[PDB]
Write a protein that binds this ligand. Structure first.
Ligand SMILES: CCCCCCCC/C=C\CCCCCCCC(=O)O[C@H](COC(=O)CCCCCCCCCCCCCCC)COP(=O)([O-])OCC[N+](C)(C)C
Ligand SMILES: CCCCCCCC/C=C\CCCCCCCC(=O)O[C@H](COC(=O)CCCCCCCCCCCCCCC)COP(=O)([O-])OCC[N+](C)(C)C
Ligand SMILES: CCCCCCCC/C=C\CCCCCCCC(=O)O[C@H](COC(=O)CCCCCCCCCCCCCCC)COP(=O)(O)OCCN
Ligand SMILES: CCCCCCCC/C=C\CCCCCCCC(=O)O[C@H](COC(=O)CCCCCCCCCCCCCCC)COP(=O)(O)OCCN
Ligand SMILES: CCCCCCCCCCCC(=O)OC[C@H](COP(=O)([O-])O)OC(=O)CCCCCCCCCCC
Ligand SMILES: CCCCCCCCCCCC(=O)OC[C@H](COP(=O)([O-])O)OC(=O)CCCCCCCCCCC
Ligand SMILES: CC(C)CCC[C@@H](C)[C@H]1CC[C@H]2[C@@H]3CC=C4C[C@@H](OC(=O)CCC(=O)O)CC[C@]4(C)[C@H]3CC[C@]12C
Ligand SMILES: CC(C)CCC[C@@H](C)[C@H]1CC[C@H]2[C@@H]3CC=C4C[C@@H](OC(=O)CCC(=O)O)CC[C@]4(C)[C@H]3CC[C@]12C
Ligand SMILES: CC(C)CCC[C@@H](C)[C@H]1CC[C@H]2[C@@H]3CC=C4C[C@@H](OC(=O)CCC(=O)O)CC[C@]4(C)[C@H]3CC[C@]12C
Ligand SMILES: CC(C)CCC[C@@H](C)[C@H]1CC[C@H]2[C@@H]3CC=C4C[C@@H](OC(=O)CCC(=O)O)CC[C@]4(C)[C@H]3CC[C@]12C
Lengths: 408, 295
């Protein structure tokens, strides 16, 4: 194991001082990293020196503790955001809102510093990831909301709603934090892959939904001037019909009849419509098509695709682990709220190599010899050799026997 | 039973979880009994303690069912699936909290701090999973000129700055929850069922021995009446030679059969045939070449 560890990483003057792991990652082999030895080395680097004066420097620069500090800071910021949105706000912001906006803008500054490290290549690589794009969009929306909040009464309520709708993205961004976990990262990738089948189901569900809604709306309300309520009514009830609310009251009202009512004066009933029973019939057919067929088909699709997706997701996560570890290795010690000071600071043997080479040469020779021996041990090789010798021997023996007649 | 070093006995006893849960339940029952007898204000608390405690005894029937051949593995399977249940629960909780906070903040723009907010965050969205969508409260008319019926006209409220976002988020949340995650969990269970089944069966077959011995060692009377039991408690060579000969014969037969099976392998025959043919061919060639001198 020690020889393999030494061979894995050591600066090469021949290849611009690049270790084997860096080449493998850049090559995107996707199998050299996943090997157990590489994972062990990655874990050892993840735990840094503490593989359980100088303590202050080594302990607080280990990636794991920095990751935990960032997570705790994010959780606290999320708690403050929740408290702010739930509680009423006066004309001027409180201390919590100042802390929140400072966090947001420090995060933006950190993103700018990271991208700054041609510029077009850097931008393309940065856009390769989607989390950064979503974070930038959310930060811009938050800035718009903050600007709107401070400008008098009529605009402040709009900024508040902007905050309320924005908090959802930060709530959902905890999946990135969960990505580190061994048993929980693949779940997110599986969900992301199943979203496509979700969309394909959604299209047909929408078609059927619209057909039923238009039919119901047209059969009833025969006379009605144009307006936008029709579009809302097309979608309203049928969508909720999927999740167990069928509106039993409105399925088929009695309509016209002579009803004396109870505990009140008799109320004359309306005159009904030309056709209504068609509405219950179509409702029954639509519910049968939707709540049973398509959902179970989606279940079958998920069952079929789960096994195929699982192993690929696991391998991909094992590969991304290296970039995660290095990213947390390069980051500053302090979390986003307090790294403004960090930004201010930033702006301001041969015998061993011979032994490793000899070990590698011995391994190469042994591997090639083993491969040759295994190939020779194949029954096909033995069968081919046996047939060839037998054929040659039989012909030689026949000639000797025929020639032996002259001796006789 | 624990009395039969003491630390080893305690560790082995704690190896099982049923005993730990039983001890905790007994302690809770004792606390409830003590609280019940001390005047009016405390008795109602002891009664509630009893009511909440009875559930553990109700659920403890799984241990009794463990003996059954066809029913024991079910319990182990459930216990193994609880982990996937928890993993689903975490993400469900995240989405639930996001939707609840959004809904609460969009409505009730002005409200002093209180603990009702936390309850309201969780109340409706959790029940939305199991088929109750609260159709009345999805989107009330809010502001309008409504004359009402069978009563004086009631002026409608002034609405809020934004509400339609609430139905939109509700639709998205229901689509994400009631369809995607549950079916994913179904797929997980389907995949893991076959793997878990055989292991559970084998483990139950192994635990059967300890079950039998435990019931073999216990006293005859049941717990209510074993107080009297506690009071009482405190107060051939030829056959062996034949078995050994049988075992030796079995060992010899098994080894001979294994050797014969190995020799019957086609690989052994192929290797032997090739070796003899190669040696024979070389010997024959030498004889043929040497035969020239005789000629
Ligand atoms: C091709 C397939 C589709 C073919 C036909 C689609 C159905 C079209 C129905 C339009 C009928 C117009 C109408 O309202 O007349 C109605 C009678 O109509 C009927 O009772 C005949 C039954 C028609 C249904 C066939 C069974 C479906 C086959 C299943 C396969 C009379 O109107 P009303 O509903 O009784 O309301 C009273 C009206 N007043 C009194 C208030 C004025
Ligand atoms: C990034 C993605 C998210 C981007 C934006 C998220 C949505 C933010 C909406 C905040 C608008 C503030 C507001 O209330 O103004 C409203 C008009 O707002 C609109 O009608 C514009 C439509 C906005 C929705 C875009 C479609 C979603 C894209 C889908 C993709 C006016 O308020 P009101 O609701 O009409 O209530 C009346 C208020 N009074 C009269 C009582 C005072
Ligand atoms: C006007 C009304 C707007 C409606 C707002 C939404 C309603 C809120 C309730 C529920 C929303 C739930 C949405 C489901 C999100 C599922 C995302 C998911 O799990 O897939 C993830 C996909 O990852 C990604 O690519 C990142 C995409 C995340 C975008 C999510 C944005 C939804 C939130 C909307 C809020 C509005 C602001 C959005 C700004 C863009 C996990 O896969 P991965 O392996 O990590 O891929 C990373 C690639 N490097
Ligand atoms: C304040 C409100 C409290 C809420 C109370 C709960 C609500 C009551 C309603 C429903 C509760 C149902 C809980 C599900 C229980 C599932 C347990 C199960 O089947 O898994 C079992 C796991 O076995 C175990 O390890 C024992 C664990 C049992 C603990 C159950 C306690 C739940 C009851 C709560 C009542 C409060 C008292 C609890 C005291 C600890 C079966 O697996 P096994 O193969 O037998 O493993 C044995 C290892 N030697
Ligand atoms: C998965 C895909 C889902 C997409 C479906 C989106 C369709 C949503 C349309 C619903 C519009 C609506 O009903 O309200 C419009 C409101 C009037 O409200 P109301 O009084 O009719 O209830 O005020 C207005 O009149 C504004 C109308 C503006 C609507 C323009 C949207 C067109 C976008 C299509 C691209
Ligand atoms: C799967 C994980 C689920 C965990 C979720 C648990 C959160 C439950 C919190 C709900 C508390 C609550 O709303 O009631 C508190 C009551 C006041 O009741 P109400 O008038 O607000 O309805 O009286 C109080 O004010 C007492 C508040 C004490 C709450 C402290 C709980 C903190 C535990 C976190 C660990
Ligand atoms: C098959 C999948 C893609 C489901 C797609 C259905 C959605 C497009 C439907 C379901 C519920 C509908 C909503 C139900 C109610 C309203 C309120 C409506 O705003 C008002 O009613 C104005 C205020 C008022 O008059 O009361 C705007 C549309 C919205 C969000 C509807 C728009 C379209 C929604 C989100
Ligand atoms: C995929 C296909 C089937 C398109 C979707 C079908 C319908 C949901 C859409 C298509 C065109 C839409 C119409 C486009 C134009 C108008 C007129 C307009 O009403 C007005 O002019 C009055 C405005 C007011 O007083 O408020 C708004 C609704 C309506 C019928 C729209 C309502 C919904 C319609 C019928
Ligand atoms: C995703 C999984 C983990 C579901 C988790 C949701 C639970 C944490 C939620 C669902 C229903 C909630 C309960 C709904 C109502 C109440 C009553 C509340 O007590 C009172 O209301 C005081 C008396 C009163 O004022 O009426 C305490 C919390 C509790 C049990 C809530 C606490 C949290 C619960 C159990
Ligand atoms: C995982 C993260 C998102 C934490 C969970 C989010 C919220 C559900 C929690 C986080 C902090 C909580 C707050 C902590 C402190 C307070 C003030 C406190 O209210 C009072 O001081 C008045 C007490 C009274 O009059 O009864 C109780 C509710 C509130 C807003 C709590 C309600 C719910 C909050 C916002």
């Amino acid at each position: 194991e020690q020889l393999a560890m030494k061979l894995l990483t050591y600066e090469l003057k021949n290849w611009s001082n690049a270790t084997c792991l860096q080449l493998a990652v850049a090559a995107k082999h996707r199998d050299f990293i996943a090997h157990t030895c590489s994972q062990m080395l990655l874990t050892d680097m993840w735990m840094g020196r503490l593989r359980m004066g100088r303590k202050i420097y080594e302990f607080y620069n280990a990636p794991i503790v920095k990751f935990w500090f960032y997570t705790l800071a994010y959780i606290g910021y999320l708690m403050l955001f929740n408290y702010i949105v739930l509680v009423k706000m006066e004309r001027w912001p409180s201390t919590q809102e100042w802390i929140v906006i400072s966090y947001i803008f420090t995060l933006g500054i950190e993103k700018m510093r990271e991208i700054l490290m041609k510029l077009l290549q850097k931008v393309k690589v940065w856009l390769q990831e989607y989390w950064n794009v979503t974070d930038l969009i959310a930060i811009l929306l938050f800035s718009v909301g903050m600007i709107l909040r401070l400008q008098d009464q009529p605009f402040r309520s709009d900024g508040r709603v902007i905050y309320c709708v924005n908090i959802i993205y930060w709530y959902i961004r905890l999946l990135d934090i969960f990505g580190v976990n061994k048993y929980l990262g693949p779940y997110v990738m599986m969900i992301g892959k199943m979203m496509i089948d979700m969309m394909y189901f959604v299209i047909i569900m929408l078609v059927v939904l619209m057909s039923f809604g238009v039919a119901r709306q047209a059969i009833l309300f025969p006379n009605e001037e144009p307006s936008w309520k029709l579009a809302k009514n097309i979608f309203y009830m049928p969508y909720w019909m999927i999740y167990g609310e069928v509106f039993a009251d409105q399925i088929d009202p009695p309509c016209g009849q002579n009803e004396t009512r109870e505990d009140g004066k008799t109320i004359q009933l309306p005159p009904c419509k030309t056709g209504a029973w068609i509405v219950p019939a179509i409702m029954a057919c639509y519910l049968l098509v939707a709540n049973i067929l398509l959902v179970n088909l989606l279940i079958a699709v998920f069952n079929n695709t789960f096994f195929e997706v699982k192993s690929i997701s696991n391998q991909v996560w094992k590969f991304q682990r290296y970039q995660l570890i290095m990213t947390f290795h390069e980051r500053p010690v302090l979390p986003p709220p307090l790294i403004i000071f960090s930004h201010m600071t930033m702006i301001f043997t041969d015998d061993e190599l011979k032994k490793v080479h000899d070990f590698e040469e011995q391994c190469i020779e042994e591997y090639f010899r083993e491969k040759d021996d295994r190939f020779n041990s194949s029954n096909d090789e033995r069968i081919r050799v046996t047939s060839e010798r037998v054929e040659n021997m039989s012909m030689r023996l026949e000639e000797v026997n025929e020639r032996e007649h002259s001796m006789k």
